[PDB]
Write a protein that binds this DNA or RNA. Structure first.
Lengths: 223, 223
DNA sequence: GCACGACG
DNA sequence: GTAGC
DNA sequence: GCACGACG
DNA sequence: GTAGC
């Protein structure tokens, strides 16, 4: 699948942060009105300290059937630094993206989108490159303040940056910690919550797209 | 400082779990009545995948002045497995312990004590070896259920194993996640809470013993 | 001076 | 490595 | 089939 | 690798 190479990936931490502060201006927090048909999930595993494996899974909604799966193993040199996940995993994901045949209506990533220090988490960043609605679903908080939602089944609260709502915290499963949902590109807080709620089945904490992707990332890491 | 070698460390995961299920019977959850004078904190860092660095710091209470610091760098072969932290970091800590001159009244460890699947976290386990009151202060939950305390300054709640109280969750700092406190050996839930509350200064999330230890663990990892 | 995805 | 106190 | 300390 | 569903 095609995408737009907006800049170089091999950059020192300081120049990468500048690239984020510039790219954040291109983000469009538009509503996603309607029922998607093709939903993609993306996950990464690391077979070695410098070898990652990116997996992209495309599911049919609302049946949740698997329509396509592609992957790419490659050298990963950029160190993990909070706030710069895109410069570590972005390149390999795009490499897998190049192989994808189905054009997703929305892509869900592991990690933040809008709920990022410079308003541009991996989900937002990748959204600008692929020019398709994106959502960031994180298992932990990177930025923003919030009031822990109660332990219900769909109980939730907004994630804030002072006064601005940058996403939401959702208790997708009772007995499990909530997940952090923020819009990426061509998406908004309200739509991301609706969609993620719709992508997560009862008994599950993680939405099917990224949940299935993570499984394949682990399976392929062996056989 | 002396200690009791209760068993072999080089054991396969399955035999190590049996050793825990047997050692749990030796645990004494007795009250710690009185003001301690010498309080120790223990932390570990890893200069290499198979090289750890254990640091033990002894502080004078209530002045919190540093009375002694010792350390030990050594080969670490046991992999990190939730529930078996003692078989990874225990050996190197004991190696540092051998160097310690001051006999602490209580030792605080990073990780669980009683709040463990088999009722024997690193803090409890090390307590049996050194035969001195121990407390496990964790930055995250390993076992047990609890109700998130409010975001006050000393707000707290009990950590449970069904009906049994195995420790407590304390909001040592506003804006920070709470810490998980469980008694090790020669300690009880009530005493551990009292002591840890007393070892943690305003503005801090982590108790001075382990906080200072962690700092030295990082400093020595360089210079 | 004092918060932050993937061995198993 | 970035970052608000 | 479906939760769990230390690059920086 | 352990572990309750």
């Amino acid at each position: 699948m095609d995408y737009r190479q907006l800049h170089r990936w091999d950059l020192p931490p300081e120049e990468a942060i500048k690239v984020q502060n510039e790219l954040r201006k291109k983000i469009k927090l538009t509503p996603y009105e309607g029922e998607p048909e093709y939903v993609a999930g993306v996950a990464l595993s690391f077979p070695g300290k410098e070898e990652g494996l990116a997996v992209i899974v495309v599911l049919e909604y609302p049946s949740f059937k698997i329509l396509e799966v592609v992957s790419e193993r490659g050298e990963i040199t950029f160190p993990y630094i909070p706030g710069l996940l895109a410069f570590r995993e972005g390149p390999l994901f795009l490499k897998a993206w190049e192989k994808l045949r189905t054009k997703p209506d929305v892509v869900v990533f592991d990690g933040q989108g809008l709920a990022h220090p410079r308003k541009l988490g991996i989900a937002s960043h990748m959204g600008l490159f692929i020019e398709i609605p994106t959502i960031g679903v994180a298992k932990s908080r990177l930025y923003g303040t919030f009031k822990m939602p109660e332990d219900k089944r769909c109980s939730w609260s907004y994630l804030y940056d002072g006064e601005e709502i940058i996403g939401c915290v959702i208790r997708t499963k009772e007995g499990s910690a909530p997940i952090f949902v923020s819009p990426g590109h061509l998406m908004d807080v309200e739509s991301s919550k609706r969609l993620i709620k719709a992508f997560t089945l009862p008994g599950r904490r993680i939405p099917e797209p990224t949940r299935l992707a993570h499984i394949y990332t682990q399976r392929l890491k062996k056989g």
